[PDB]
Design an enzyme around this catalytic site. Structure first.
Site, PDB file in Angstrom:
ATOM      1  N   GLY A 192       2.153   6.748   9.501  1.00 37.89           N
ATOM      2  CA  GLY A 192       3.952   7.005   8.837  1.00 37.89           C
ATOM      3  C   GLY A 192       4.617   5.571   9.626  1.00 37.89           C
ATOM      4  O   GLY A 192       5.600   6.036   8.587  1.00 37.89           O
TER       5      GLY A 192
ATOM      6  N   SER B 158       3.659   2.524   8.462  1.00 34.79           N
ATOM      7  CA  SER B 158       3.657   1.585   7.682  1.00 34.79           C
ATOM      8  C   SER B 158       4.597   0.839   6.887  1.00 34.79           C
ATOM      9  O   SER B 158       5.139   1.971   6.419  1.00 34.79           O
ATOM     10  CB  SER B 158       2.260   2.111   6.529  1.00 34.79           C
ATOM     11  OG  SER B 158       1.172   1.713   6.962  1.00 34.79           O
ATOM     12  N   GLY B 159       4.835   0.007   6.686  1.00 34.51           N
ATOM     13  CA  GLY B 159       6.029  -0.577   5.563  1.00 34.51           C
ATOM     14  C   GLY B 159       6.614  -1.399   6.508  1.00 34.51           C
ATOM     15  O   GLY B 159       7.878  -2.541   6.443  1.00 34.51           O
TER      16      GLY B 159
ATOM     17  N   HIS C 161       1.178  -1.314  -0.357  1.00 38.37           N
ATOM     18  CA  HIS C 161       0.023   0.214   0.188  1.00 38.37           C
ATOM     19  C   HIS C 161       1.086   1.620   0.330  1.00 38.37           C
ATOM     20  O   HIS C 161       0.511   2.170   0.027  1.00 38.37           O
ATOM     21  CB  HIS C 161      -0.869  -0.102   1.613  1.00 38.37           C
ATOM     22  CG  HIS C 161      -0.919   0.541   2.598  1.00 38.37           C
ATOM     23  ND1 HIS C 161      -0.648  -0.944   3.544  1.00 38.37           N
ATOM     24  CD2 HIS C 161      -0.080   1.202   2.899  1.00 38.37           C
ATOM     25  CE1 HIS C 161       0.321  -0.272   4.446  1.00 38.37           C
ATOM     26  NE2 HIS C 161       0.146   1.404   4.644  1.00 38.37           N
TER      27      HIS C 161
ATOM     28  N   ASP D 279      -0.341  -8.118   1.785  1.00 35.82           N
ATOM     29  CA  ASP D 279       0.102  -6.199   1.155  1.00 35.82           C
ATOM     30  C   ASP D 279       1.835  -5.751   2.117  1.00 35.82           C
ATOM     31  O   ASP D 279       2.366  -6.465   2.911  1.00 35.82           O
ATOM     32  CB  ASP D 279      -0.498  -5.218   3.077  1.00 35.82           C
ATOM     33  CG  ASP D 279      -0.147  -3.461   3.348  1.00 35.82           C
ATOM     34  OD1 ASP D 279       0.753  -3.507   1.538  1.00 35.82           O
ATOM     35  OD2 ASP D 279      -1.090  -3.127   3.379  1.00 35.82           O
TER      36      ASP D 279
END
Lengths: 36, 223, 36, 223
Positions: free
Chosen positions: B175, B177-178, B40, B84
Site C-alpha cells: 500500500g 508503493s509509488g 506497477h 518502475d
C-alpha cells in the site's frame, strides 16, 4: 538454512494493493509451496 | 510502513493518495499538474488525493483530483520491475500551500549512508493486514548496492537502490508503493518492492529517480 | 489466447540435463499448474 | 536439436561432450586446453569428450579428457541466465586434427539474418524424451533483438540473442546447452535457454560470445 532457503523462497512482491508477486526458485499472493 | 511513526497532519505535503474507489498506492507531487508513482501502480480512472492525513475522514485540506493522463516508462519491465516509474497528469491544477507542496527533483544521486524519509498508508505489521488511516513515516539510510546486491541476488538492476535495515522491523509494505523516498529534500526513490516487509536481510527496494530526471523533465514538458 | 496465456506460461528452462527452470507469472521440471 | 539432421562423423570437430557419468552438456574447443560451455552447465568432476560422433560407442577418434579447472563468469546470474559463460581447462592438451579442431573466437558481432550452425546430442522431439546417440545439427539465422525482445519480453538482456524460427519445428533442446552456435566460421553463441523446444514464437536463446572475447582471452592467458 539461511533465509529459510529457496523452495519458493523467492516471492519478491510489490508494495501495491494488491501486489504483484513473482517467485524466483528454479527446478493477494503466493509464497509457501514448496520444498524438498 | 512497518516500524514507523505517524508523521503528523501535513508534515509531508507532497505525499499523494491514489484511489480507484479505495487507496491502492502512494505518489509524489513533483509540480502542480504532475504526480510520480510507480509504474506497477497503473490502473484506469485514478483519483489523486491531496492534503491527506486521515484517508477515511474528510479533514479539510484535501484536494481530490482525477487524472486526465497517465504515462508508464517506455522501458518498464513488469517481469523485473526495472524502470518502475509512471507520471500522472491531473485534470485540474492543485493548490500549493502550507500543507500542499511539491517535491524537488534530484540533481545528483544520494550516496549509500544518506538518511531519507519514507512514508505512506500501507501496512504496519510485517505480519497480517492492519492498515493505518493515518500517514506513517520512516527514516532509513541508503545501503550499499554491494549489500543491496547481496540481499536480492541477481535482481538489483542499475536503476534501483536498497534503503533500510538488513535487520528488519522497519520498512515499507503493501500500500506504500509509488510513494516518496525523500533525502536531503529532493525525491531520490519510489517505493517499489522488497521480499516481505521488515524481514531480515530483505530491505526495501526503491527506484533511483536520479536516473529519470530527463525523462520526467522531457515528458512533463511535452504533454 | 496468444501463447496459451500466462498462468505458469512462463516456464523458461535451460537446455541442460536436467534443466533449471524458472516460472515468470506473478500474482526435470515445472510447467502447468495453474490458472484462473 | 529438434528439426535438425545428423551432421556426419566429425563434420563438427570443435563439438565437445561433457560427461559426469552421462552426457549432460555440450561445449566448444576454442583452443587445445580450453573449452567454452554455458555457466549453467557447471558440475564437479567433468570429463571432456573429444572426437565424438556416437556418444554410446567408442568409434576411435575420441579423446576423453577430465577437467583440472572450471571457471564460471564473475557476473553469471543464475536467476536471469545473464552472462551464461564458463571456461573449462583440460588436464592434458588435446590432439588437433582432421576431426579434432578448435573454433575461432569472434572479432565482430554477426548481424540479425546471418545463418549459423547449431548442434548437439540433446533431444529431437519438442515432445517427449528421445535422445540421439548421434550428433544432430541445425541451420538457423540470427533474429532481430526486436523480435527476440517480443518473444520473451523482459528477459532478453544485452548479452543474448535469438536464433531460429518464430515458427518452430526447428530448435535446440535439453542436452544441447553449452554447445556451439557457429556463424561465418567463428563461434557467436552458446546454447543457453528458450521456453520449450521448437515451440512457435519461442525461438532459442543464445549467449552473445562477442561480448566476452576479452574475458576469455584474458582468463585463458592467466590460468
Amino acid at each position: 538454512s539461511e533465509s529459510s532457503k529457496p523452495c519458493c523462497d523467492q516471492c519478491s512482491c510489490t508494495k501495491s494493493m494488491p501486489p504483484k508477486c513473482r517467485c524466483s526458485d528454479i527446478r493477494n499472493d503466493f509464497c509457501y509451496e514448496p520444498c524438498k | 510502513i512497518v516500524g514507523g511513526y505517524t508523521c503528523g497532519a501535513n508534515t509531508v505535503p507532497y505525499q499523494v493518495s491514489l484511489n480507484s474507489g479505495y487507496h491502492f498506492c502512494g505518489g509524489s507531487l513533483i509540480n502542480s499538474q504532475w504526480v510520480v508513482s510507480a509504474a506497477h501502480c497503473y490502473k484506469s480512472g485514478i483519483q489523486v488525493r491531496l492534503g491527506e492525513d486521515n484517508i477515511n475522514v474528510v479533514e479539510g485540506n484535501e484536494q481530490f483530483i482525477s487524472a486526465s493522463k497517465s504515462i508508464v516508462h517506455p522501458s518498464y519491465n513488469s517481469n523485473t520491475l526495472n524502470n518502475d516509474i509512471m507520471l500522472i497528469k491531473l485534470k485540474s491544477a492543485a493548490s500549493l500551500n502550507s500543507r500542499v507542496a511539491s517535491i524537488s527533483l534530484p540533481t545528483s544521486c544520494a550516496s549509500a549512508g544518506t538518511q531519507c524519509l519514507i512514508s505512506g498508508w500501507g501496512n504496519t505489521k510485517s505480519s497480517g493486514t492492519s492498515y493505518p488511516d493515518v500517514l506513517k513515516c520512516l527514516k532509513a539510510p541508503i545501503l550499499s548496492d554491494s549489500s543491496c546486491k547481496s540481499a536480492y541476488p541477481g535482481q538489483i538492476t542499475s536503476n534501483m537502490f536498497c534503503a533500510g535495515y538488513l535487520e528488519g522491523g522497519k520498512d515499507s509494505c503493501q500500500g506504500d508503493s509509488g510513494g516518496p523516498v525523500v533525502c536531503s529534500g529532493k525525491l531520490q526513490g519510489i517505493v517499489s518492492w522488497g521480499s516481505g516487509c521488515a524481514q531480515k536481510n530483505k530491505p526495501g527496494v526503491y527506484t533511483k529517480v536520479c536516473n529519470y530526471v530527463s525523462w520526467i523533465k522531457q515528458t512533463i514538458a511535452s504533454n
